[PDB]
Design a protein around this ligand. Structure first.
Ligand SMILES: C=CC1=C(C)/C(=C/c2[nH]c(Cc3[nH]c(/C=C4\NC(=O)C(C)=C4C=C)c(C)c3CCC(=O)O)c(CCC(=O)O)c2C)NC1=O
Length: 243
């Protein structure tokens, strides 16, 4: 399932989304993957109420270091495209949370967000991450976006932009590839932590999922195609499940 060649959505998504989906899949392809079963063994889902149809493709995996690796592609009607990805770490290893959300319409990408988010109580990334991320240097983008109020969960390296041209699209993709290369290497060298530290990282992941559920822009997309009760179950059990 991890080849995207069987995807029905891929050919119709915004090109930046296609490039990022491919890069994520390439990063995961040779890991010690096992399937992760979403609620009701959800793969493909389509729904419509009174407006536009929402189509969603889900792929989910797990490894010893990552309890849940979720790649979701979505399209609303013919306008709105979305790529959503979260690698949820196993708290035992103390790794940060990789996440990204890319939203596009007919006139281009409106929102591109990626981060390696902290799970420590002091809201800092592990020292090895800080060092590696600082060495990449700060990227220059013309149109930055300020994080909403629930976005206190994001690191100081969080990127949130509207890409202004294809060069910036490519620059953002390359920065996400760099984040993934750092993250995959740190996962090899990570050691199992003490019970007390595992608990702190668990709490940090819970908090991340609770704050992400406050994103009303995501919720309203789901609500308009499936209704309020479906949307709440999807947000809380599929996208941002509390462990
Ligand atoms: C069904 C799945 C799914 C859909 C439909 C979705 C849609 C979605 N996500 C966002 C913004 C959107 N997404 C995020 C961030 C994230 N969101 C995440 O799922 C993750 C992992 C991050 C961060 C790593 C932020 C911070 C914002 C801006 C929220 C705002 O402007 O209020 C928008 C508003 C775009 C804009 O303002 O230009 C939409 C429609 N996101 C999804 O995940």
């Amino acid at each position: 399932d991890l080849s995207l060649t069987n995807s029905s959505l891929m050919p119709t998504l915004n090109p930046m989304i296609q490039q990022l989906a491919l890069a994520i899949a390439a990063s995961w392809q040779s890991l010690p993957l096992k399937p992760y079963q979403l609620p009701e063994d959800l793969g493909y889902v389509e729904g419509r109420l009174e407006g536009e149809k929402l189509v969603i493709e889900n792929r989910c995996y797990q490894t010893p270091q990552f309890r849940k690796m979720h790649l979701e592609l979505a399209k609303v009607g013919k306008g709105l495209d979305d790529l959503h990805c979260v690698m949820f770490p196993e708290p035992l290893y103390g790794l940060p949370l990789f996440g990204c959300d890319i939203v596009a319409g007919p006139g281009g990408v409106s929102a591109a967000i990626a981060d390696l988010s902290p799970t420590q109580s002091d809201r800092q990334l592990p020292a090895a991450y800080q060092k590696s991320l600082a060495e990449l240097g700060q990227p220059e983008f013309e149109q930055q976006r300020e994080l909403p109020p629930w976005g206190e969960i994001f690191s100081e390296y969080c990127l949130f932009i509207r890409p202004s041209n294809v060069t910036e699209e490519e620059r953002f993709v390359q920065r996400v590839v760099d984040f993934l290369q750092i993250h995959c290497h740190q996962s090899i060298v990570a050691e199992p932590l003490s019970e007390a530290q595992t608990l702190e990282h668990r709490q940090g992941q819970i908090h991340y999922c609770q704050q992400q559920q406050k994103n009303d822009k995501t919720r309203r997309v789901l609500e308009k195609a499936f209704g309020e009760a479906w949307a709440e179950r999807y947000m809380s059990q599929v996208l941002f499940d509390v462990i």
